[PDB]
Amino acid sequence: GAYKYIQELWRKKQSDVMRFLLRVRCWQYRQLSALHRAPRPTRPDKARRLGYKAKQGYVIYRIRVRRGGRKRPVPKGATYGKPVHHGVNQLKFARSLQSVAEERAGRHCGALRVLNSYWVGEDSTYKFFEVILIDPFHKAIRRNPDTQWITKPVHKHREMRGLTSAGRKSRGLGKGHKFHHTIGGSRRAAWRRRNTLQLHRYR
Amino acid sequence: YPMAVGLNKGHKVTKNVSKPRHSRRRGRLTKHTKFVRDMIREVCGFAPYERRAMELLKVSKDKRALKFIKKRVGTHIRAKRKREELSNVLAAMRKAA
Amino acid sequence: APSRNGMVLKPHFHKDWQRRVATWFNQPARKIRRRKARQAKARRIAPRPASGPIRPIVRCPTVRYHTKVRAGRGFSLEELRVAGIHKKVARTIGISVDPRRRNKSTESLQANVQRLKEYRSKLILFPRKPSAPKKGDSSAEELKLATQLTGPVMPVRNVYKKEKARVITEEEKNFKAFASLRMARANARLFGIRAKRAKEAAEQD
Amino acid sequence: DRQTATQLLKLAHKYRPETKQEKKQRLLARAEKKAAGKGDVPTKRPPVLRAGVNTVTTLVENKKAQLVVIAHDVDPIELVVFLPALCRKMGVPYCIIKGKARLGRLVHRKTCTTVAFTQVNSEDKGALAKLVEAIRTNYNDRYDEIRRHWGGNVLGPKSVARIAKLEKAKAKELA
RNA sequence: CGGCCCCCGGCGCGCGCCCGGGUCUUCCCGGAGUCGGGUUGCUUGGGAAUGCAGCCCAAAGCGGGUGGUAAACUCCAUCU
RNA sequence: CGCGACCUCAGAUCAGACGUGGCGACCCGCUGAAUUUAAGCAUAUUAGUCAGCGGAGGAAAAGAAACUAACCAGGAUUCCCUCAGUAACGGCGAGUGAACAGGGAAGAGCCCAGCGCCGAAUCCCCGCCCCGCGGGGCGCGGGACAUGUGGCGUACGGAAG
Ligand SMILES: [Mg+2]
Ligand SMILES: [Mg+2]
Ligand SMILES: [Mg+2]
Numbered sequence: 001g002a003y004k005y006i007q008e009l010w011r012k013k014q015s016d017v018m019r020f021l022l023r024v025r026c027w028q029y030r031q032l033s034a035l036h037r038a039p040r041p042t043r044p045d046k047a048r049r050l051g052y053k054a055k056q057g058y059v060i061y062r063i064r065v066r067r068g069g070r071k072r073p074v075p076k077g078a079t080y081g082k083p084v085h086h087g088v089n090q091l092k093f094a095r096s097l098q099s100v101a102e103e104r105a106g107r108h109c110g111a112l113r114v115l116n117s118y119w120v121g122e123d124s125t126y127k128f129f130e131v132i133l134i135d136p137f138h139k140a141i142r143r144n145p146d147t148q149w150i151t152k153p154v155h156k157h158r159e160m161r162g163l164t165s166a167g168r169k170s171r172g173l174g175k176g177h178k179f180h181h182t183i184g185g186s187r188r189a190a191w192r193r194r195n196t197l198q199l200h201r202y203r
Numbered sequence: 204y205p206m207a208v209g210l211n212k213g214h215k216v217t218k219n220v221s222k223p224r225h226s227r228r229r230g231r232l233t234k235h236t237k238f239v240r241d242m243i244r245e246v247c248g249f250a251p252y253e254r255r256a257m258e259l260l261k262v263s264k265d266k267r268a269l270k271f272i273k274k275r276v277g278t279h280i281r282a283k284r285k286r287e288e289l290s291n292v293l294a295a296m297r298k299a300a
Numbered sequence: 301a302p303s304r305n306g307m308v309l310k311p312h313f314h315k316d317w318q319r320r321v322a323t324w325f326n327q328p329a330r331k332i333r334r335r336k337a338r339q340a341k342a343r344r345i346a347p348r349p350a351s352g353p354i355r356p357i358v359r360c361p362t363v364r365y366h367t368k369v370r371a372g373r374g375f376s377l378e379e380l381r382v383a384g385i386h387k388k389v390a391r392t393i394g395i396s397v398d399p400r401r402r403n404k405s406t407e408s409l410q411a412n413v414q415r416l417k418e419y420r421s422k423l424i425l426f427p428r429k430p431s432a433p434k435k436g437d438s439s440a441e442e443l444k445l446a447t448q449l450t451g452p453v454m455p456v457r458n459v460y461k462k463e464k465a466r467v468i469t470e471e472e473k474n475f476k477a478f479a480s481l482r483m484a485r486a487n488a489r490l491f492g493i494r495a496k497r498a499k500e501a502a503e504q505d
Numbered sequence: 506d507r508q509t510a511t512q513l514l515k516l517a518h519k520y521r522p523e524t525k526q527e528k529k530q531r532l533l534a535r536a537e538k539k540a541a542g543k544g545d546v547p548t549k550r551p552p553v554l555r556a557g558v559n560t561v562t563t564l565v566e567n568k569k570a571q572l573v574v575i576a577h578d579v580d581p582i583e584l585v586v587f588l589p590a591l592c593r594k595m596g597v598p599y600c601i602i603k604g605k606a607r608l609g610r611l612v613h614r615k616t617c618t619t620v621a622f623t624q625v626n627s628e629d630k631g632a633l634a635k636l637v638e639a640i641r642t643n644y645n646d647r648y649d650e651i652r653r654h655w656g657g658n659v660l661g662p663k664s665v666a667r668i669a670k671l672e673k674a675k676a677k678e679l680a
Numbered sequence: 681c682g683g684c685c686c687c688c689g690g691c692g693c694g695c696g697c698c699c700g701g702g703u704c705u706u707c708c709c710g711g712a713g714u715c716g717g718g719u720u721g722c723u724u725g726g727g728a729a730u731g732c733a734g735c736c737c738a739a740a741g742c743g744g745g746u747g748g749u750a751a752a753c754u755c756c757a758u759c760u
Numbered sequence: 761c762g763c764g765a766c767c768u769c770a771g772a773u774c775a776g777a778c779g780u781g782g783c784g785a786c787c788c789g790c791u792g793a794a795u796u797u798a799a800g801c802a803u804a805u806u807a808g809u810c811a812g813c814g815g816a817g818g819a820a821a822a823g824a825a826a827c828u829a830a831c832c833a834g835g836a837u838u839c840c841c842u843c844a845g846u847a848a849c850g851g852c853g854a855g856u857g858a859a860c861a862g863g864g865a866a867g868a869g870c871c872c873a874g875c876g877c878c879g880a881a882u883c884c885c886c887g888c889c890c891c892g893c894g895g896g897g898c899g900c901g902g903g904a905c906a907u908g909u910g911g912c913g914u915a916c917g918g919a920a921g
Contacts, residue, residue: 209484283732
C-alpha cells in the first residue's frame with residue numbers, strides 16, 4: 001500500500017518538495033568518505049524491487065563516483081600514432097558510471113556478493129549510488145533456497161565480469177534486430193565465430 | 204477467385220476469435236492507480252518547465268507553448284500529450300471556480 | 301598482379317586467420333559421443349519414447365515456405381484448452397507446451413486438436429502401484445513394443461490432395477486471366493490515390 | 506503538545522499488540538478449551554492497534570482506521586509525507602506525535618513510524634472520541650492552511666543580530 | 681574367464697508433508713534520473729545515426745517499445 | 761543536572777565466519793596500438809586483434825521475447841549446414857560484411873518487488889535435552905533480527921475470493 005506512493009513520489013524529482021530532500025542529503029552524502037556503509041536503504045521501495053529483503057546478511061553501501069568522461073592516460077596528450085587516434089579529450093568509456101560504482105564496492109568487500117544498485121543523487125562532480133550486497137556465508141542466506149543461487153561459486157565477483165544489470169547494459173546484448181552484433185553469447189564470442197575459418201574434414 | 208497479389212491477398216482461412224492475451228492490457232489506468240497519481244500531484248506539485256508552460260498556455264499562445272514542450276520533453280507525440288493535460292489543469296483551475 | 305581474362309576476387313585473408321582455424325578431426329569422435337549420449341539416454345529413462353515429446357503441426361512463414369508443414373515447439377494453450385487437458389499436467393503426459401504461440405486461424409487450430417486427441421488415444425500410462433484412474437487393465441498387453449523412433453506421430457506427413465479430373469467448362473476457360481493479375485495489382489496501388497481524389501470532390505460542394 | 510500525547514499514549518497503552526510470550530499461552534487457552542469444549546466462537550472481537558506504514562495506508566484509503574498517530578523523525582521523510590495529505594482526502598483523522606522511538610515502544614519494537622486505531626472497545630469509545638475533535642481541529646480542518654505554510658528561512662543569531670544592529674541605527678537615524 | 685577387496689545410482693519397515701479441477705460472479709493487476717529527445721565520442725554491414733557512453737533536458741498511463749529513409753497524419757500488426 | 765529510549769557512528773587480540781595469492785589452453789569485463797595493405801598517404805585496412813589490466817568455472821557466457829515477421833504466420837538461449845561473399849558499408853578505392861526464413865544437434869522451464877490477504881503465521885544465535893552413527897535437526901527454553909515488512913499463497917501463459 002505504502003510503497004506505491006514512494007515509487008510515484010520519487011518519479012517527480014523536479015517538484016519543490018522532492019528537489020529539496022534530494023539536495024539536503026546530497027550535501028550530507030558529499031561530506032562522507034568515498035565508500036561508506038549505510039545502516040539502511042535510503043529508498044526502501046527501490047531496494048526491494050531490485051532484490052533486497054530486510055533480514056540479516058543483506059547490507060547497503062553508498063559509494064561516490066566522480067562524474068565526467070575519461071581522459072586518455074598518455075603523457076602530454078601525445079599518442080604517437082595515426083591522426084584518427086589523437087583522442088585525448090573527448091573520450092567516453094563504454095561502461096557506465098553506475099557500473100564503476102558497483103565494481104569498486106565488490107572490490108573493497110571481496111567476501112560479499114553484489115546483487116545490484118540504484119541512484120540516490122548527483123551534484124556536478126559526484127554521483128551517489130547505493131550498492132546492495134549479500135553475505136554468502138550467513139545462514140539466513142545459505143538456507144532459503146530462493147537465495148542459494150548466489151552462494152554458488154560461479155557468482156564470485158559479478159561486476160568484474162559485467163553480469164549485473166548495471167554492467168550488462170553496456171554489453172549490448174538482447175534479442176532483436178538492433179542487437180545482432182552479439183548473436184552468440186557476447187561481443188567477442190560472436191567475433192570469434194564470424195571470423196573462424198570453419199574448414200571441414202571433407203571440403 | 205483467390206489470387207496472391209492485389210487488394211484481397213492471400214490464401215483464405217477463417218479467423219479464430221479469442222479473448223486477447225493478458226500482456227496487452229498493460230498500460231490501462233486501473234482506478235486505484237489513477238487515485239495514487241492524482242492524489243500525489245497536489246502534495247508534490249508541478250515541474251519548473253510545466254509551470255512555465257502553463258503560464259504560456261493561458262496568455263501567450265499555444266503554437267509557442269508546444270514549441271517549448273517539443274524541446275524539453277522529447278518527441279512530438281509526447282509534446283501534444285503533455286500540452287493537453289496541462290490544458291486540462293488550466294481548465295480545471297479556471298473554469299472550475 | 302591481374303592478368304588475362306579472369307575473375308576479380310576478394311579473398312578475405314587480410315586478417316590473421318591461422319590462429320582462428322577450425323579443423324574437424326574430432327567430428328567422428330563426437331558423432332559416437334552423441335550416439336552414446338542418445339543410447340544411454342534412451343535406456344536411462346523409461347519405455348517413454350525417445351526423441352522426446354509430441355510436437356505440433358506448424359506452417360512455415362515467409363512466402364517461399366508457406367506451402368509446407370513443419371514440426372513446431374509446443375501446443376499453444378488454446379489447443380490444450382479445447383482438448384481438455386491442463387497446462388501444467390500436459391508436460392508429464394509427453395506433450396510440449398509453447399504458451400507464447402498464437403492461434404488465429406481455425407483450420408490450423410482444429411488440426412492440432414485432432415492431433416492431440418489422437419495422441420491421447422494411443423497413449424498408455426502406468427500407475428505407480430496399480431490404482432489406475434482414467435486407465436484400466438494390463439498395459440495394452442505390454443504396449444506392443446518398447447520405444448519409438450524419430451517422432452511419435454510422424455511429425456511432418458506433408459500431404460497433398462487428389463483433385464482427380466474436371467471438365468473445361470464455360471466461365472472457367474474464359475475469365476480468370478492475366479488481365480485479372482494486372483488490374484488487381486494496379487488497384488492495389490491506385491487505391492489510396494483514388495480515395496484522395498474522392499475526398500477532393502467531397503469537399504467540392 | 507505533551508498533554509495531548511500523554512492522553513493518546515494512555516489510550517494506546519491497553520491496545521498493546523501481541524508479543525511472543527503471550528502468543529504462547531493464548532494458543533494454549535484457545536486450544537486447551539478446543540480440546541475440552543470445541544467452542545464455535547469463544548471470542549467475538551480481539552481488538553488491536555495496527556502498526557506499519559504499509560498496513561496503515563491500506564486502512565486509510567479503505568476508511569477502516571479511526572485515528573492515525575504518525576511519527577516525527579522518519580529518516581527518509583518521503584516514507585510518510587503522503588499520509589497527512591492522504592488522511593485528509595479519505596476523511597480519517599491524523600495526529601503528529603513526538604518521536605518514532607516512543608510509539609515503537611508500544612509495539613515492543615524499536616521504531617514503528619505509524620499506528621492506527623481500527624477497532625476500539627465500545628465502552629472506551631468515549632475516550633477515543635473525546636480526543637478526536639481535540640485532534641482533527643489541528644490537523645484535518647487546518648489542511649487548507651498547513652499546506653501553504655513554508656518552513657525554515659531564518660538566519661543565524663550572529664547574523665540576525667547585525668541586521669537588528671543596522672535597524673536600531675535606523676531607528677536612531679529617525680529619532 | 682574365474683575368485684578377492686573397496687566404492688556408486690536406483691525396490692521395501694519408521695520420520696516429514698498433503699484438496700486439486702471446471703463454470704459463472706465480483707475485485708485486483710506491475711519495476712524512473714529509466715524511457716525518450718538533443719549534442720558529443722567510440723563502435724557496427726546498419727547506411728538522415730546498429731550499439732554503447734558522457735553531458736544537458738527529461739516522461740506517459742487505450743501508455744510504452746519495435747515495424748531496417750528524416751518528418752507530420754492515419755490504420756494495422758506485434759511485444760510488455 | 762541525572763536517567764531512559766532510539767537514531768547516527770566509533771573501539772576491541774570480543775564469540776564465529778569469510779576474502780587476499782597462484783594457474784590462466786578454453787570463458788567474461790575493460791583498455792588498446794603500430795608494422796602492413798592502399799604500389800606514395802592522412803579516412804579506411806591491419807583490428808576492436810597483439811601487448812596491458814581485472815574476474816572466474818570445469819565449462820563460461822547467453823537464456824524464456826519491450827523477438828522475427830507482413831502470411832495459411834512463426835515462437836528462450838547455444839552449436840552446426842546453408843543463407844552468402846549476399847543485403848549493406850567504403851578516398852564507393854583498396855577492402856570489409858551481418859541477419860531472417862529453411863535443415864539439423866540439443867531441448868526445460870521458472871521465481872520476485874509491486875497490487876491485496878492472513879493477530880510476523882518468518883528468520884538467526886545461545887543453553888539443556890528426544891536421540892543417533894560418519895552430524896545435521898522438525899521438538900523445549902532464553903537473547904536478537906524484523907512493521908522502514910520476515911513468511912505463505914500469487915507473476916501478465918493472467919491472478920485472487
Ligand atoms: Mg543490522
Ligand atoms: Mg570444393
Ligand atoms: Mg576450480
